[PDB]
Amino acid sequence: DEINTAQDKWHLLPAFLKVKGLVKQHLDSFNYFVDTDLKKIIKANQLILSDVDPEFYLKYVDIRVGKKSSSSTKDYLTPPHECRLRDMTYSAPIYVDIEYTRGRNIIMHKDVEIGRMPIMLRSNKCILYDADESKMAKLNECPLDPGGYFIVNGTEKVILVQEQLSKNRIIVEADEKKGIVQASVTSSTHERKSKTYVITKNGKIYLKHNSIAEEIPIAIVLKACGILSDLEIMQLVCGNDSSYQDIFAVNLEESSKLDIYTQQQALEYIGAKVKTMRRQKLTILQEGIEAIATTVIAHLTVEALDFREKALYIAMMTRRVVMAMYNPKMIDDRDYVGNKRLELAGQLISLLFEDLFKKFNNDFKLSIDKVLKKPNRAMEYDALLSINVHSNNITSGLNRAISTGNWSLKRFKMERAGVTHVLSRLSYISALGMMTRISSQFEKSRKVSGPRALQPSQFGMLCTADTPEGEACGLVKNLALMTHITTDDEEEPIKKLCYVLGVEDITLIDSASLHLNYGVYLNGTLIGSIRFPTKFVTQFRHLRRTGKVSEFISIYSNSHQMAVHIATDGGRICRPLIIVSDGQSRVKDIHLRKLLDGELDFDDFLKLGLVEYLDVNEENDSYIALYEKDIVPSMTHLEIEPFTILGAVAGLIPYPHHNQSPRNTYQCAMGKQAIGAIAYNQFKRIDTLLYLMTYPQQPMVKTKTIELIDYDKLPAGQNATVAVMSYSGYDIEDALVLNKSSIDRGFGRCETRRKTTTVLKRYANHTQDIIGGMRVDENGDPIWQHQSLGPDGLGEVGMKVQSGQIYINKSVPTNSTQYREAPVIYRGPEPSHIDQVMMSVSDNDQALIKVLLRQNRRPELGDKFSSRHGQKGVCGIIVKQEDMPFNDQGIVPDIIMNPHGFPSRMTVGKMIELISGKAGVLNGTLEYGTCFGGSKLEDMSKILVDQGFNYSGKDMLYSGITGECLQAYIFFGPIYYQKLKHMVLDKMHARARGPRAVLTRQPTEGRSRDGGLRLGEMERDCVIAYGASQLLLERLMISSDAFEVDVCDKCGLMGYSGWCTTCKSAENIIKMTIPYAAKLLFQELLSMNIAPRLRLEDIFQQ
Amino acid sequence: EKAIPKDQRATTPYMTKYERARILGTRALQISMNAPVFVDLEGETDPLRIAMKELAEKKIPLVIRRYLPDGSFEDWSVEELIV
Amino acid sequence: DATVPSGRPETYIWRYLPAPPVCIRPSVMMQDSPASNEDDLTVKLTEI
Amino acid sequence: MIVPVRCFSCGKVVGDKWESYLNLLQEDELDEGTALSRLGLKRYCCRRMILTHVDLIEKFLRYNPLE
Ligand SMILES: [Zn+2]
Ligand SMILES: [Zn+2]
């Protein structure tokens, strides 16, 4: 049956994901790091030298990760799951070759190790790279695990994708009330990162820099940058425009208002304010400081007697400020996805490694100095011992940064946290959506919803539904399904190609005609003007399509600002689109036939110029068609598949285009919390917490994304027979009615698995902990606390452990001979079972114990369920099967969903899912609820009628309690339901009296520490508004912290034991009750010398 | 500090909700401290329910002292305060 | 008000530092090392 | 993991149908619908129990720790 390209073009998406997976940002970045950036760091810090002994140079000639040149095969790595079990870092050694000179004129190589690099899972260096599920089984790895994260100390850490503003790009931003216009560029070079503002103050444009002490008049800076004619300054920042010249004439005149100027004079004016350089090279404080003042003023390094590039950069920035002054709305939008760059795990680790390597080299040079600083006996033999002992700092720094997420980089001088997060293992989709997560840049002024807003420019780049609730809402964003993050491409050959294509260099042109033709930019930097900009852009795109230039290079022509921009940097988000030429799509189904045949993979669609990547800025010039059936000749591109605008997690929702959007976002939140299957090795894992469904079912109505991301292989939920009807009155406000005997048969059954880790650590006095125990009573019978312990003192595998029983019998030395008991007690409301006890050693030689406790859970009142449409709700009643309504065949619902949850939430996709799933089970087929598609409702109705059911899914039911026909037909069929991790068994908490804080004497704050429930200021306001004074006293003072203090009636100072201890009398000591917090406040005030003296009076005596 | 005579009392002759709640609480506290009661319990063992019965029979022996903002007060026995 | 002692304006000048009760600045048992750890206010007053 | 013994809704025994359904699909290949109806799974709840089951036990057994 012949290929119909209007429907088979979606196969480009599976072909794309077959070679560029969902976790590809991480894998590609780590591969690029360990394959080029390590070499680049080594080349940068190639030689480390000492002041003394010029007959000594230590060279860094080659670096490698995980492989020596002694053996062709790679080094043996401990498998990642073994690292997870033993709480080790999954790492590979960092091998370098060294040229260090011997005293007797000897030059030699070596292959030495300078630490361990943590290896991202499924990277080039990972043992899991190219394993075929048999190697995966042998290694105890799930083949469906995404990879893309690290195992440091047994913990799965993902370095989340970070979203920042584009570096080295100008952002114009106006203001109101203040009436300033501020254009800023963040110049992030390799060695420095500085911001160069161009402010407006009192109608005059100024330049502001962190290094410069004062804001400088702009015409002074333009003269200092070789543009001194004072007429071309006007021709550079205004051109021929009466308004702009009028705006800028003030600054033109203020150039002279100080004095008339030459270039060197303006340079001197610049140099008089450059603050300092930590008092080194002090002999340069002259006109010769302007040079580094101007070469530090931006990211454009000028290394000669020409300032054309920097001068025109400043002039263009000033022109932008002037255009914003004349016409607001000519400012850049900081929340536009074209202005954002995504930095990745590879770049992060590259910066971290370069800094740790610099610290390593500094310390190594100092150690070399110490070794060679002796008069005699200074043999060069084994200069590498200090490298055998100082190599651990690289390993330690990498491990610490990945483990804590704190990145102390001194060179760039910033301390950022939250870089890495623990890989959430709540569900398979939870891990997958943890990957493809993007954290937005801090200091966003979170008081506003500017960045929190969903941008139209994120279409097909970031998931439209996968954003969190709570505080983070738009601050966390997720990658869309079919995207790509560009890589840094070299701008030098591209600039040469631009010159070849008709761009006259920026030095051959005059100022008068500069704003007469389009100017060609390159990463924001003007490199010349172009005649026929559209022809230039077209030829550049032809070169990109034919493979002459890189496909991640984007060109776009801006018409308001007459410019042709070319971007080559990494961190741009882009997606493939089918090129439309002459009103025709270029795929035309012969390529689709070849693609389905197996040859002609996705990258062939680029190597033949049938598809191309567009970043956000190129879409500003494109004209994209959603479907081939609506291509017009004016269009430029065709969508490969419009549902790719949703990410991986939102791809679980069936018919998301029939729902109100907040419900889709809520499902994005709930699916990550769905209990289901975790991995094929989920029983070999020993994890801190793991919720597993006993009988997972795959959804009756899946989507294309579900099978793309393999959620149908590890599903989280069950297909509940659902009747949408009001019932029993325990299903009001989202509460659910659950069928007992569906629960009895295993519906909604799940287990909790929790891990407890102990270390039998070693001590300075040659002592260690022990697991001795299992003591008995007189009969020889084990005592109750050791009932399920076993001879070794580690809870037996298979046995039930109840609250109070010991499952690890850890004895600690009393003088770390004698052993104080520190047993591990099970403190659980409900009994657990011991299913795994793992005995092992950690990397540092000492025993490691892990005991996994499993707890089977049966659904109860207050357990939380959700239906992929944001309709969550607790179980409100569990009724017997006979009380449930039944149809003609005796089918009873497993769940009853109240009908009042539909009219306001407007989740029509849930109804369509019910009908599609019903027709699907009757027909024997799984149906599809793919976004902007899926199984058609009328075809499902045809199946329902052909099977004997009503087309609308409404069966006539009988009441279970009366037996009569219900007077309404009931919407009745299968719906996919998820049991969420939130189970009332883990939430129920009750405190009468327990631990109190040592400081405040108030009940603890932790549900685990038997804490009390805070009665806050708003509850206090409510109780005051009731006028319940005695209740106020009881709740706040008497039942939180009541202290019977002794108060002196002469000095208002609290004493003790009826002793004023300032009057030393015991005469005037009154006894009264005050909050211990008040007593604490008085004692703290007395500390600061403040004397809050209490004045008393008799309660009675009228 | 002066007691306004029962002849001329300006405040409400109606027990307020706060006065009722406080009277019940005080009387229940007294009963929980084994104070004798003046109603037929009929199986009641809870001091608050006993005190509610006494209030329903208007048998609570307490006096409301209503201080005016100037400092003077007037005394309203619980029996005379109408509910 | 100079009726009472300490109403003098010279008492507002730090001349004697009162050391707060250790209850105000408690020492937490079994934190990190087996050796007992102290707290910020106590360390500061030791410096003083 | 392994096929439920009983349909969650009706309580019909479906645990003796999984191997025979697999055999009907693999050998003498039939549609899923006809294979389900040939086993007596007429009610759609019973059909769901077999049609949507994911046989994770066969994957979990690849990680046998007592090989
Ligand atoms: Zn006193
Ligand atoms: Zn059934």
CSV table of N, CA, C and O and ligand atoms in Angstrom, one decimal, chain A residues 721 890-892, chain D residues 6-12 14 41-49, ligand 2:
chain,number,residue,atom,x,y,z
A,721,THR,N,-12.1,0.3,35.1
A,721,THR,CA,-13.5,0.4,34.6
A,721,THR,C,-14.1,1.6,35.3
A,721,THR,O,-14.3,1.5,36.6
A,890,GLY,N,-23.1,-7.5,33.8
A,890,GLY,CA,-22.6,-7.7,35.1
A,890,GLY,C,-21.3,-7.0,35.4
A,890,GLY,O,-20.7,-7.1,36.5
A,891,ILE,N,-20.7,-6.3,34.4
A,891,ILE,CA,-19.5,-5.5,34.6
A,891,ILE,C,-19.9,-4.4,35.6
A,891,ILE,O,-20.9,-3.7,35.6
A,892,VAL,N,-19.0,-4.2,36.6
A,892,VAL,CA,-19.1,-3.1,37.6
A,892,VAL,C,-17.9,-2.2,37.4
A,892,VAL,O,-16.8,-2.7,37.1
D,6,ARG,N,-7.4,-12.8,38.2
D,6,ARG,CA,-8.8,-12.4,38.1
D,6,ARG,C,-8.9,-11.1,37.4
D,6,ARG,O,-8.1,-10.2,37.6
D,7,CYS,N,-10.0,-10.9,36.5
D,7,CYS,CA,-10.4,-9.6,36.1
D,7,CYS,C,-10.7,-8.7,37.3
D,7,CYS,O,-11.4,-9.1,38.2
D,8,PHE,N,-10.1,-7.5,37.3
D,8,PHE,CA,-10.3,-6.6,38.4
D,8,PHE,C,-11.7,-6.3,38.6
D,8,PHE,O,-12.1,-6.1,39.8
D,9,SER,N,-12.5,-6.3,37.6
D,9,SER,CA,-13.9,-5.8,37.7
D,9,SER,C,-14.9,-7.0,37.9
D,9,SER,O,-15.6,-7.0,39.0
D,10,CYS,N,-15.0,-7.9,37.0
D,10,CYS,CA,-15.9,-9.0,37.2
D,10,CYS,C,-15.4,-10.1,38.1
D,10,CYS,O,-16.3,-10.8,38.7
D,11,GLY,N,-14.1,-10.3,38.2
D,11,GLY,CA,-13.6,-11.4,39.0
D,11,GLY,C,-13.4,-12.7,38.2
D,11,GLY,O,-13.1,-13.7,38.8
D,12,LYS,N,-13.6,-12.6,36.9
D,12,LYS,CA,-13.4,-13.8,36.1
D,12,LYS,C,-11.9,-14.2,36.0
D,12,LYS,O,-11.0,-13.3,36.0
D,14,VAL,N,-8.7,-14.9,34.5
D,14,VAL,CA,-8.0,-14.6,33.3
D,14,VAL,C,-6.6,-15.0,33.3
D,14,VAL,O,-5.9,-14.9,32.3
D,41,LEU,N,-13.3,-14.2,26.5
D,41,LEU,CA,-13.3,-12.9,27.1
D,41,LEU,C,-14.2,-12.0,26.4
D,41,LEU,O,-13.8,-11.3,25.4
D,42,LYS,N,-15.5,-12.0,26.7
D,42,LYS,CA,-16.5,-11.2,26.1
D,42,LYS,C,-16.7,-9.9,26.7
D,42,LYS,O,-16.7,-8.9,26.0
D,43,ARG,N,-16.7,-9.8,28.1
D,43,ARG,CA,-16.8,-8.5,28.7
D,43,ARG,C,-15.6,-7.7,28.5
D,43,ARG,O,-14.5,-8.2,28.5
D,44,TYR,N,-15.8,-6.4,28.3
D,44,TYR,CA,-14.6,-5.6,27.9
D,44,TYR,C,-13.6,-5.4,29.1
D,44,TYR,O,-12.4,-5.2,28.8
D,45,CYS,N,-14.1,-5.5,30.3
D,45,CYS,CA,-13.1,-5.5,31.5
D,45,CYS,C,-12.2,-6.8,31.4
D,45,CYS,O,-11.0,-6.6,31.6
D,46,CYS,N,-12.7,-7.9,31.1
D,46,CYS,CA,-11.9,-9.1,30.9
D,46,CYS,C,-11.0,-9.0,29.7
D,46,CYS,O,-9.9,-9.4,29.8
D,47,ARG,N,-11.5,-8.4,28.6
D,47,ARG,CA,-10.7,-8.2,27.5
D,47,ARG,C,-9.5,-7.2,27.8
D,47,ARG,O,-8.4,-7.4,27.3
D,48,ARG,N,-9.8,-6.2,28.6
D,48,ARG,CA,-8.8,-5.3,29.0
D,48,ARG,C,-7.7,-6.0,29.8
D,48,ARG,O,-6.5,-5.7,29.6
D,49,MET,N,-8.0,-6.9,30.7
D,49,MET,CA,-7.0,-7.5,31.6
D,49,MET,C,-6.0,-8.2,30.8
D,49,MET,O,-4.8,-8.2,31.2
E,2,ZN,ZN,-14.2,-8.7,33.4
